[PDB]
Structure 1
Amino acid sequence: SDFLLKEPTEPKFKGLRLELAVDKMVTCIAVGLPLLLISLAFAQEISIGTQISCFSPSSFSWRQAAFVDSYCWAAVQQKNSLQSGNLPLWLHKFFPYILLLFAILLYLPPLFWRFAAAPHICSDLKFIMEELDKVYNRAIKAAKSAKYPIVEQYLKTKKNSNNLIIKYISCRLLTLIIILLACIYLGYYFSLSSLSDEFVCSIKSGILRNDSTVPDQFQCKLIAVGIFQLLSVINLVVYVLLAPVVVYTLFVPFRQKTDVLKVYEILPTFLHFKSEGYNDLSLYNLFLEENISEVKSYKCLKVLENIKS
């Protein structure tokens, strides 16, 4: 019955989404934004010039007063002369550092996927979809003349295996873990009162312990905390919106519409290949329906299930 449904199989599989659309969307948002927020912070933390400012006495010089700002900038680490809450202080100093920490931490599971599992996905999808075309092509030619094909047996092989889905879930689980850790850190950082960005520093160490010309206390002010709290809540808001998305990517079997192989039951050369117990077949169903565009036989089957009327 081949009158207008013949496939030359001339165009190969050039563009294959080796990672799902949601995973690419999450990775771009989860990694891009902290990179963009730091680029935002670094751009305007150098526009203002300084990151800490301490009110030195008028008797100080421009290098005596710069020392106070420089000494007290490093004195944030030392939890003996600042005061109250000392943990909120060195988080203010290290917020752009930590913002990059989970910026690149959230990039590793995508990087690991592109190294250890993406090439395996590429070939298996290429094999499954090429053999799907061959099955459909031979199916119509069998009808043109008028058991357990290669595709079906290969899918059962993936159902009994779970090595690749473990890589996928662990990459998604690590992304969830790092996002949740980032949510805790960004949530705690935004929880810090904006009045806690000023600390009463004191330069009394070494020969300056008994020095009388040096005031006992200096009123410092981390002036970049204001922008950081804006960036923390901005990054927290997306991460508490990305977290429900990421946990949805963990449920590999459940995120299927069961419309990937249901259309192949029409062929006479053919199948409950939907999902079962978080197997590698369940993961391949995600990548088959995501990369269901480049397979030319699938579109021919869509009409066939819609031509029975």
Structure 2
Amino acid sequence: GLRLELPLDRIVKFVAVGSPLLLMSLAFAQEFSSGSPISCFSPSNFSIRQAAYVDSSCWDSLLHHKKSLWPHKALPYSLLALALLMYLPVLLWQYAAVPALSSDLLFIISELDKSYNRSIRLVQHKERYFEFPLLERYLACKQRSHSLVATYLLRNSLLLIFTSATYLYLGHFHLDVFFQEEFSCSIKTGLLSDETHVPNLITCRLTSLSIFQIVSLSSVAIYTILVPVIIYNLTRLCRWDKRPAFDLLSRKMLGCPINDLNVILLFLRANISELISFSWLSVDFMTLLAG
């Protein structure tokens, strides 16, 4: 029943994955309802099937003559790609960091409990500093590594990079097609030319500009909101974490803070409820700890 993810990262992943899916569903469920996502004012003597042909041709082309409006067609697929892009760092953390850290937390929790139990017999009263050789050798070995701190940094770095990519994509493509609801589509380009019945230019109107605007604005707003929490999570480990065995923990509590020790200390602090935290909530001393 161990908890292997910080509470903030859980809600960050949930929001970042869920929101593009919700926006994509809000766009799929409207164009199926309204029918065609584009209308065209065909001439009066175009019967019925020729009007449908004009509609389909202008929707397929999507090129304003008098310049290109391709983002309208590729909205839900581009939104769906964002879901996979957000889900990739979660998969990386799931399949690259949690197996080692799970064992590293279980072992340290068990031996911390054992050390507390051993110190209990000393409480009811110095062969204590050397009494835990494992807690010094193992912790010195892990402090010199750089194994999974890199993955923890890189997950947030990837999330920030993809957020910046979304910013660039939106601000470079969707901005130039705002407030553009109609365009002059043409079909007299290929073999249909040299045929006098069909007019030269046909006006057509997009029927889903509101969905486009709402999706763009909402996505920009939420992915703006989601940046400070990400940078806070990234910068959380930069400052040194401070709250018998805890004395030995504080003994090697110094130096550059970029190790594997900081992440396991953070996960230990976030999982303090597993071990006996009776004395943790009450922040002489031996008399109080006697009970």
TM-score, with structure 2 as normaliser = 0.86
Deviation per residue, 1:39-66 (Å, 9 max, x gap): 1221222221221222222222332222
Q: How does 1:91-170 map to 2 (within 5 A)?
A: 91-144=71-124, 147=130, 149-170=133-154
Q: How does 1:61-80 map to 2 (within 5 A)?
A: 61-76=47-62
CA distance in 1, matches of 2:107, 2:61: 61
The answer to whether the Cα contact below 8 Å between 1:180 and 1:243 also exists between their aligned partners in 2 is no
Q: How does 1:104-253 map to 2 (within 5 A)?
A: 104-144=84-124, 147=130, 149-188=133-172, 191-253=175-237
CA distance in 2, matches of 1:256, 1:27: 25
CA distance in 2, matches of 1:204, 1:216: 7
The answer to whether the Cα contact below 8 Å between 1:187 and 1:236 also exists between their aligned partners in 2 is no
CA distance in 2, matches of 1:229, 1:68: 26
Shift of 1:140: 1.0
Give 2:118's aligned amino acid.
Answer: R
Instruction: Identify if the C-alpha distance between structure 1 residues 62 and 289 changes in structure 2 by more than 3 Å, giving closer, same or farther.
Output: farther
Deviation per residue, 1:86-121 (Å, 9 max, x gap): 2xx111211221111112101110111111212222
CA distance in 1, matches of 2:240, 2:40: 58
Q: Name the counterpart of 2:25.
A: 39
Instruction: Identify if the C-alpha distance between structure 1 residues 152 and 65 changes in structure 2 by more than 3 Å, giving closer, same or farther.
Output: farther
Structure 1 unpaired stretches of 5+: 1-13
Structure 2 unpaired stretches of 5+: none
CA distance in 2, matches of 1:68, 1:181: 36
CA distance in 2, matches of 1:127, 1:52: 62
% identity of equivalent residues: 42
Instruction: Identify if the C-alpha distance between structure 1 residues 222 and 144 changes in structure 2 by more than 3 Å, giving closer, same or farther.
Output: same
Shift of 1:129: 1.4
Instruction: Identify if the C-alpha distance between structure 1 residues 295 and 222 changes in structure 2 by more than 3 Å, giving closer, same or farther.
Output: farther
CA distance in 1, matches of 2:147, 2:124: 41
The answer to whether the Cα contact below 8 Å between 2:239 and 2:257 also exists between their aligned partners in 1 is no
Instruction: Identify if the C-alpha distance between structure 1 residues 161 and 84 changes in structure 2 by more than 3 Å, giving closer, same or farther.
Output: farther
CA distance in 1, matches of 2:254, 2:18: 34
The answer to whether the Cα contact below 8 Å between 1:263 and 1:302 also exists between their aligned partners in 2 is no
Q: Which moved more, 1:98-107 or 1:287-296?
A: 287-296
